């Protein structure tokens, strides 16, 4: 709860002073992290999906749920119910544990990060961060990892608008 | 594939019920627990 | 020189008993596909969606909410 302590000790009343919230619980709070690998390329490959499964299991610590295919389109050689992508949902203490391990340890080894657009949000109070490889996370080493898939890391915030979500992310760490 | 089958009681030996199955998805002889009129209780029936 | 020319025999749907007519238990009140009329009181829906009385009484076609109807039987 070190990151819980950092959030609760000083972030909460700083936000309250900055935005003059009427009560104490208009404060935006981190609520959900969802991970989608996007392994749809594996139309016939079976080891690719499984390999993504243990990759996500090791990176998070929770068993990833394989996701089926909503529709069937022949443009991308897929049918109904094909196992496409992964699905991991952290929640509770895993919010701050994963956020710590990312922003303090895993993130800094990226090649040429110089910030991301404050407009690179959804415009309604969330954020999706992308990673182009699986070696940015220290838990997975080079020998075990064969390929890299650019997955999607989403940030869910209870903010009613975008500016306070952006500044909250800055106050906790990297925008 | 689709065929007619008959179910026989494993105690009396009377072919009480008839039904159908898919021969490819069910190559083995199916078994069900139906009601046997002669004994007036429930027994186990097998495809012949 | 014609690809058409075929049809199916009619099924005689509709209402078989009138509103306010005394009815005997177990008699058909309405033959119909789907549910154009819902079963009300002392009446049930058959396997093929017919409506039949369950007790002796008088037939009454009431109205449920705005866009659907029902039929009920009231004893004497």
């Amino acid at each position: 709860n070190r990151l819980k302590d950092q959030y609760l000790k000083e972030i909460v009343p700083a936000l309250m002073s900055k935005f003059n919230y009427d009560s104490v619980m208009e404060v935006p709070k981190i609520d959900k992290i969802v991970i989608n690998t996007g392994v749809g390329d594996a139309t016939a490959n079976a080891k690719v999906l499984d390999s993504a499964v243990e990759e996500l299991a090791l990176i998070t610590g929770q068993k990833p749920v394989i996701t089926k295919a909503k529709n069937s389109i022949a443009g991308f050689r897929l049918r109904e119910g094909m196992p496409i992508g992964a699905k991991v949902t952290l929640r509770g203490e895993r919010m701050y544990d994963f956020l710590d391990k990312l922003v303090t340890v895993s993130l800094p080894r990226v090649r040429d990060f110089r910030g991301v657009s404050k407009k690179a949000f959804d415009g309604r109070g969330n954020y999706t961060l992308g990673v182009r490889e699986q070696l940015i996370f220290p838990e997975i080493d080079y020998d075990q990892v064969s390929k890299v898939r650019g997955m999607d890391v989403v940030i869910v915030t209870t903010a009613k608008s975008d500016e306070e979500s952006h500044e909250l992310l800055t106050q906790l760490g990297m925008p | 594939m689709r065929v007619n089958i008959t179910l026989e009681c494993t105690e009396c030996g009377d072919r009480n019920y008839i039904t159908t199955k898919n021969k490819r998805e069910n190559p083995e002889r199916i078994e069900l627990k139906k009601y046997c009129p002669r004994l007036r209780r429930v027994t186990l029936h097998r495809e012949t | 020189s014609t690809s058409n020319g075929r049809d199916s025999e009619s099924k005689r749907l509709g209402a078989k008993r009138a509103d306010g007519q005394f009815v005997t238990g177990g008699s058909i009140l309405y033959r119909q596909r789907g549910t154009k009329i819902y079963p009300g009181t002392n009446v049930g829906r058959g396997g093929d969606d017919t409506l039949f009385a369950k007790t002796d009484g008088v037939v009454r076609f009431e109205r449920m909410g705005r866009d659907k109807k029902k039929v009920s039987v009231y004893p004497e």
């Binding site: 959900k32 109070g125 869910v156 209870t158 | - | -």
Partner: protein
């Protein structure tokens, strides 16, 4: 931004789903149950006339002594059963109320059952 779901709304949806099969007639009234964070309630209801017949609650004058929040359920169940039996009610149908028949609701039902009420 996420809109938190409303627990009571979906609870009432499930209650309406349950009520499609359960009807409180005069001879066999309906036993409705409502559960909150603090306490639990119970009501015996008929539907052909739309009037209640017996009731009990944790916050009633009786059942002052309390324990963990399953013993309050047992106590309110036995009190409502006794009150209904004193009024000649013997056969009832248990209206679950959109909850699950697992915890407080189950204990209340068993407490009502062990008294003079054929649920």
């Amino acid at each position: 931004m996420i809109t938190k779901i409303d627990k009571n709304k979906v609870r009432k949806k499930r209650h309406a789903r349950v009520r499609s099969k359960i009807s409180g007639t005069e001879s066999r009234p309906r036993l409705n149950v409502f559960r909150s964070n603090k306490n639990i309630y119970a009501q015996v209801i008929d539907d052909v006339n739309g009037v209640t017949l017996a009731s009990a609650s944790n916050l009633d004058k009786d059942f002052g002594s309390a324990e963990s929040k399953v013993d309050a359920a047992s106590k309110v169940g036995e009190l409502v059963a006794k009150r209904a039996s004193e009024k000649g009610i013997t056969s009832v149908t248990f209206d679950r109320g959109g909850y699950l028949y697992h915890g407080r609701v189950k204990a209340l039902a068993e407490a009502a059952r062990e008294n003079g009420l054929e649920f």
